[PDB]
Structure formats: structure tokens, C-alpha cells
Design a protein around this ligand. Structure first.
Ligand SMILES: Nc1ncnc2c1ncn2[C@@H]1O[C@H](COP(=O)(O)OP(=O)(O)OP(=O)(O)O)[C@@H](O)[C@H]1O
Ligand SMILES: Nc1ncnc2c1ncn2[C@@H]1O[C@H](COP(=O)(O)OP(=O)(O)OP(=O)(O)O)[C@@H](O)[C@H]1O
Ligand SMILES: [Mg+2]
Ligand code: NA
Ligand code: NA
Lengths: 394, 394
């Protein structure tokens, strides 16, 4: 079985100033392919060391993938290094140069000269287009082998990689992942409900992963086994599974709103906007989402419809219902969501961090759910948002 | 300057099934020492591969630190591999085997037969006591070179490493690092601006790291050189620097509001709440942030005071200004921020994804800034949030 080598370029990665997720993500994406990954490197932004790593990786591998160091600064050296490692000169490509000048002209700026080095390639490199920045990628095919250069930021390289991967002509293996997402049920109760279906072999395995949007049950391994097995697991978890694969809670809400021809608004205290943020993450949200109020002070809550009588008692079911009713009547939406309670670090009104009420107000009346969430400030905020969305999809 | 290599061992670190923070925490602890860390590695639990990597590492390094693979399973193989790499045999240490039997008797159990291997050591190795788990570590001195084996889990290895590290006799140098956080200046421009101050020598180095919150400029190396080059660099870039070190934009905004005794509110369209969300990330936001609105429909935009004549050009500096001044009057706040623009993926009002206006209104007037962000929907939304916060800290 042939080897893939994966190097993430960046001095900041050595020290975790940025945590290297790229090498693991790229390794995860290679699972459907018969290549072995024996190691992954993080390498400093330095030519001679980087060139040596590349020279070695290339000699042993069917595929070498790199990330990072495709920028314009003296710390961007991946191209020089790869050129050194493969013993080819850098040549300026005038057409890509022009694409870079146009990118800057479009912003009413002059292209700084430094950028020229991004238009630079070796004779065996093909370009990988990067519409999301100035740093295009490389794809070198040489002696049966592939070497791909990718930009550091994920928002840049993910699409680039998606595009080039199938074309590499790597040998396939019938590997699958199925991710089933649940809400309102802990890991143990899941393992219990599954019983024997909770298998863990060389062929197929099943895991629980706790996440802020509920516990995921991940089935992986051989395609056919993942298929039969996940089918039975969804079966036995029919009540708690809200979605699969790339389905999110915000997207299940969008599909319910468009089915019903219904609208939504929000009123938020502890979440500070995050619940609006999360509804609007999904493209097409303006088809149903009218807007929201972040009522972060006592003046804001009164102004936008929460009774006076309730302003000194914000950690309460009564408050979360009043906020959801306030937003629904202000905006005129079919449905309205509200989040109130204690994020952390400090307790509030004699209640501890993680004490949260989420409310849904709709045509037939309001509902409130009390939660007691584990985690720090930002984790409690996150789980609150998902619990608010869950009032609509579970 | 001599090399330090750092290897994390475990197949699950390659795939990020477990997140490798060990190699980075080790690299950081090595800072006060005149060693160059050129790379960090993660390696599969496989004896022949790991051996070759230890061998290559040991050949080129003054220090080699391995993490993990010290358990009892057929997949814990670090000892064998070190053994093999250094051409020395594994020996049972009866005393350490005794300590391992005491560990299991303490829990009322017999030691399983697998745990035998945890007492193997090579002749060149002294023992490193693990008083929090079963596997002790090794310190190997040979050829004027050190090689340390450490357990995987951090509560085990951290006290072990902290103990052995000052004994290794590594050469010391006074280290510093300064982290300058800027907004509103591109990476190419930072280079040009800084000119000959963008040093990359052995003693001293200056690096740029793009983030969604702004380009970070990092100086690291010899202490006297770092303070000098950071103060001149900060002088060149004085307008664009909003924070140092751990500072986030939300925190800087917080510092300015408290400093002046001032309040803030927001009005958001394309960001959807993510501005309020980022502001309220920081404990004690309630002391200055009164709240905000998310004006995501045309009706909400009118309800909350975008002028009617602007409803068909929401993508404009005119509308941003008016959103800001409305939010201000609506909450009675000293200042207010607004965002408006095209998130993507679709154009709006004839303008392409990435076209964004942010605005700040205050007691002496308002100001607007326009951007053309190149990335996907989620990146545009996040760059916008930081673009707005930057208006208060320039
Ligand atoms: N391996 C990685 N894992 C996660 N994030 C990364 C990784 N590499 C880089 N990043 C993020 O992306 C930025 C990219 O840095 P780098 O300067 O290497 O990219 P580049 O290839 O030069 O491309 P660009 O000029 O497009 O940023 C880093 O500051 C970091 O925030
Ligand atoms: N590189 C790493 N970075 C951060 N955490 C790690 C790393 N490696 C391991 N861990 C943590 O500790 C565990 C490591 O298990 P591993 O088998 O590597 O340890 P070991 O040295 O064999 O000793 P033990 O038998 O006590 O696990 C992981 O499951 C994870 O919690
Ligand atoms: Mg770069
Ligand atoms: Na920040
Ligand atoms: Na807002």
C-alpha cells in the first residue's frame, strides 16, 4: 500500500499559536483511498529545512500534500522550497500575475511588488485556482507521483482540495462515515439503548461524540458494513435522531419554516446575538428570518416588550416566555425564540452558570425548557443556542 | 544552533481523533533554551515506521522528546521502537515491575500480563517516575545527546517533564516573544511598511500571520533584540495596532468603553447577531453593551429606522451610517456600530459577495469604512464583525 505524506507549514503551528487542524483534516479526507499515513509533519517557515522535508517526503510517497506558506512575505517559502526539493527553477506566469493585479485593482489598490512571488511556478506545476485570496495552489505530477500545494486558511484550501482530490487518480477503497446526530440524551443512555449494535471491530466501528448540538453517533469503516449498521442504529434511535451528515439544527429549522410558509424572530439575553448568528449562517435565511433583538440591559428589555414586573427576575421560565412573546409581537413572526439565564463565569440571582431557559412562542401558545448546562461561558452560550433551535426540530 | 525534535506517537493524532497539543506544549517549554525546533511530528503506532523516525531524529538532534505509546496494548510500541532505533536491547527491571504490581494491588486487582512490558528499559536509560499512572518514562543519554520518553496523558507527563528538563544540561538563552495585533493593513503592505525591520536571522525573527481578526505581527528570539524590534515595529504600524499578546478586539473595545464611561449598541444586517455575540463573549460586557438589533428583513430594517429611500440600497455607506445613528438613538447609547453588505453566495443590489460597510456613530459624528472581502459566506460575516470592532480601536 502506498504512502501519503502531509506537511503543514508554519512556525506558529510548531508552538500551537495556531493549532494545526489541516494535517488531520487532509488525512481524514484520504480515508477513502488506499494510501497509508504513517506520520504528519509541522515544519517551520524556513527554506532549507522545508526543502529537505519535501525532498524526503516525495522520495517515499505516492502523494505529498502541503498547506501554508503560499503568501507574499519573507515567511512564505513553500514554493522556493518545493522548487529546491524538485530541482526546478521558479518561472513568473504573466497570466496569473495579471489575475493578481486585477484582484487589487478591484479594491482600488495598487498591488504591492512583494505579491509577484505568488505568480511564481516550476515547469511541472499546474495551477490550482484560488478565487478566495491572492495565493493560488500547485499541482505537480512527476514520475507517477503527486505533490499538491495548498494555502493555509481552510476557507481557501477546502474547495481547492475538493476539486483536485478526485483528479489525482489515487486507488480507491470502499470506506464510509455516517454521522447521526441526536439531542437530549447522554452517551451512556445511547450505548445502553443500542446494546449489541454498539459493535467495535476492524471492519466497522461505532462511537459516541458529545458536541454542543447534542451527542453524535459516528459509524465508520467498510462502506457496506457502515451502511447496514447505521440503518439499524437510526432505527433503534428513531426518537432522538434529528439529522445526519451535514444537516445542522439551523438547517432543519429552515426546512420547517419553508414547509409551513412561516416566519421567525428572536429575542436574546445571554446568547448576545449568537442565536440570530446561527439561524443566519445557512444561505436562504432571509426567506423566513425577520430579525431579532439582543436585549442585553434592563432598559432594552423594557423597551422591547418584557413587563416591568419581570425585569429583576431574569433567570426564570416566566421571563423566557415573555421575551419570546415580546419578539413574536414586535416582529409579527409566526414563531419566536428566546434565551435567558447564566452564562458564567459568575452566578446570577442565586443561580449557577449553565442555568438556562429557552422559549418558543407560536400560534398555539408558548413553551419553556429549563436546562443545566456544563461548560465555560462560551460553551454555555453555544449550547443555549442549540437548545433554543431544538424547540423547533425535536 | 543545535536542533530539538519532538514526536507525538499515536495513530489517532494523525487523524485528529485526539487533538495533539503535546508536541506544541513541549516545543513551548523549550523556549528558554538555545535549540532550534524546525519541525514536530506525529507518528502512527507502528514499530518499523516509528523506529526509522526516531533514528532520523536522533541522528540530527541534540534533544529528541517522544510523547505517548507507553501503555500496555499491542498498539503501545514506543519502547520497542526506541530500542530498535538506538540498537540496544530491552531489559526487565524487577523493581519497576514491582511498582506496577503495587499499582494494581492498590485498586484490588492483579496486574494483567500485558503490563509486563511497561518495565522494559534499555541500558542507556534512567527511569522517570510517573507517580500518577502505570508507565514510567525514560531519560537516555548517549553520544552527547538526550532522548526522553513521556507518557501520553498530560496530567502524567507534565510533572515528569518539568522535573527532568532542567537536568538535561541544555544551553540557555534569554527568550522573548511579542505578538502585535493589527487591523486595516494587508500583509504585503506590512512587509513594505516595515522594510529592513522584517528581520529573519538566527537570533531574531519577525513573522506575519493572517487572521480573520487582522494580520498578527510576531517577533521572537533573543530577549534584547525582541524588545527593540517590537518597539520600532509598533512605531511604524501605530495606527493599525489595536492590541498585544492575549488581547482580543472585543476586549480592547471593552477597555475603551470602561475608560470613557461609555455605552455601546449595535444594528446588524449581514452579520446576523455575530457582532453582538462577539461583543458579549467577554465577561463584564453588561457594564457597557446595552444591546442591539438584528434587522434582517426589509420590514425590520424600516421598523428600526433605516430611511425608506435607503431600503433598495442597503449595501451602501449611506445606509450604514443611518443604521448606526439609529441604533444609537434607539438605545440611548454613547456609541453604536452597524454592519451591512453582501455575505454571499449571491450578489445583492448589483454588488458582489464581500462588499461590506461598517459604521460607527458617536457623540461627535459617524464614520464609515468599506471593504471587499474575498472569502465564503461565513468568512465575510466574521471579517465584518472584526471590521466593525476595529472602528473603535482603529
Ligand atoms: N495547519 C493549519 N491548521 C489550521 N489553521 C491554519 C493552518 N495553517 C494556517 N492556518 C491559518 O491560516 C493562516 C494561514 O497562514 P499562511 O500564512 O501559511 O497561509 P498562506 O499559505 O501563506 O496563504 P494566505 O496568504 O492565503 O494566508 C494562519 O495564520 C492560520 O491562521
Ligand atoms: N499528543 C497528544 N496531545 C494531547 N493529548 C494527548 C496526546 N497523546 C495522548 N494524549 C492524551 O492521553 C491519552 C494518551 O494515550 P497513550 O496510549 O498515548 O498514552 P501512553 O504513553 O501509552 O500511557 P497510558 O497507558 O497511561 O495511556 C490520549 O487518549 C489523550 O487523552
Ligand atoms: Mg503566509
Ligand atoms: Na479578536
Ligand atoms: Na446587534
Amino acid at each position: 500500500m502506498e504512502r501519503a505524506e502531509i506537511l503543514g507549514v508554519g512556525t506558529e503551528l510548531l508552538y500551537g499559536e495556531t493549532l494545526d487542524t489541516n494535517t488531520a483534516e487532509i488525512a481524514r479526507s484520504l480515508k477513502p483511498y488506499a494510501l497509508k499515513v504513517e506520520r504528519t509533519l509541522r515544519v517551520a517557515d524556513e527554506v532549507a529545512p522545508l526543502a529537505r522535508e519535501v525532498e524526503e517526503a516525495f522520495a517515499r510517497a505516492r502523494l505529498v500534500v502541503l498547506s501554508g506558506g503560499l503568501g507574499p512575505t519573507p515567511d512564505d517559502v513553500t514554493r522556493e522550497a518545493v522548487a529546491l526539493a524538485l530541482g526546478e527553477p521558479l518561472e513568473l506566469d504573466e497570466a496569473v500575475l495579471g489575475e493578481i493585479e486585477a484582484f487589487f485593482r478591484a479594491r482600488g489598490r495598487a498591488m504591492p511588488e512583494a505579491n509577484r512571488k505568488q505568480a511564481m511556478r516550476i515547469p511541472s506545476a499546474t495551477w490550482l485556482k484560488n478565487p478566495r485570496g491572492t495565493a493560488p495552489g500547485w499541482w505537480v505530477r512527476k514520475g507517477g507521483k503527486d505533490l499538491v500545494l495548498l494555502p493555509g486558511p481552510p476557507p481557501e484550501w477546502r474547495p481547492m482540495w475538493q476539486e483536485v482530490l478526485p483528479r489525482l487518480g489515487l486507488p480507491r477503497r470502499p470506506y464510509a462515515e455516517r454521522v447521526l446526530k441526536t439531542w437530549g440524551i447522554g452517551e451512556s443512555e445511547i450505548v445502553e439503548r443500542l446494546g449489541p449494535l454498539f459493535v467495535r471491530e476492524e471492519e466497522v466501528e461505532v462511537g459516541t461524540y458529545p458536541k454542543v448540538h447534542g451527542v453524535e453517533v459516528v459509524v465508520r469503516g467498510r462502506e457496506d458494513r457502515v451502511a447496514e449498521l447505521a440503518e439499524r442504529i437510526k432505527k433503534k434511535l428513531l426518537k432522538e435522531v434529528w439529522g445526519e451528515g451535514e444537516m445542522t439544527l439551523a438547517e432543519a429549522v429552515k426546512r420547517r419554516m419553508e414547509r409551513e410558509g412561516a416566519t421567525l424572530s428572536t429575542m436574546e439575553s445571554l446568547t448576545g446575538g449568537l442565536l440570530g448568528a446561527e439561524i443566519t449562517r445557512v444561505p436562504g435565511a432571509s426567506r423566513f428570518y425577520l430579525g431579532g433583538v439582543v436585549s442585553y440591559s434592563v432598559g432594552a428589555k423594557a423597551r422591547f416588550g418584557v413587563p416591568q414586573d419581570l425585569l429583576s427576575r431574569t433567570v426564570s421560565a416566566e421571563t423566557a416566555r415573555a421575551m419570546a412573546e415580546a419578539a413574536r409581537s414586535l416582529f409579527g413572526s409566526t414563531y419566536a425564540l428566546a434565551t435567558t439565564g447564566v452564562a458564567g463565569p459568575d452566578p446570577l440571582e442565586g443561580e449557577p452558570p449553565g442555568t438556562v431557559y429557552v422559549a418558543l412562542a407560536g400560534p398555539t401558545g408558548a413553551e419553556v425548557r429549563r436546562y443545566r448546562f456544563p461548560g465555560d461561558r462560551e460553551t454555555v452560550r453555544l449550547r443555549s443556542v442549540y437548545a433554543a433551535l431544538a424547540l423547533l426540530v425535536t
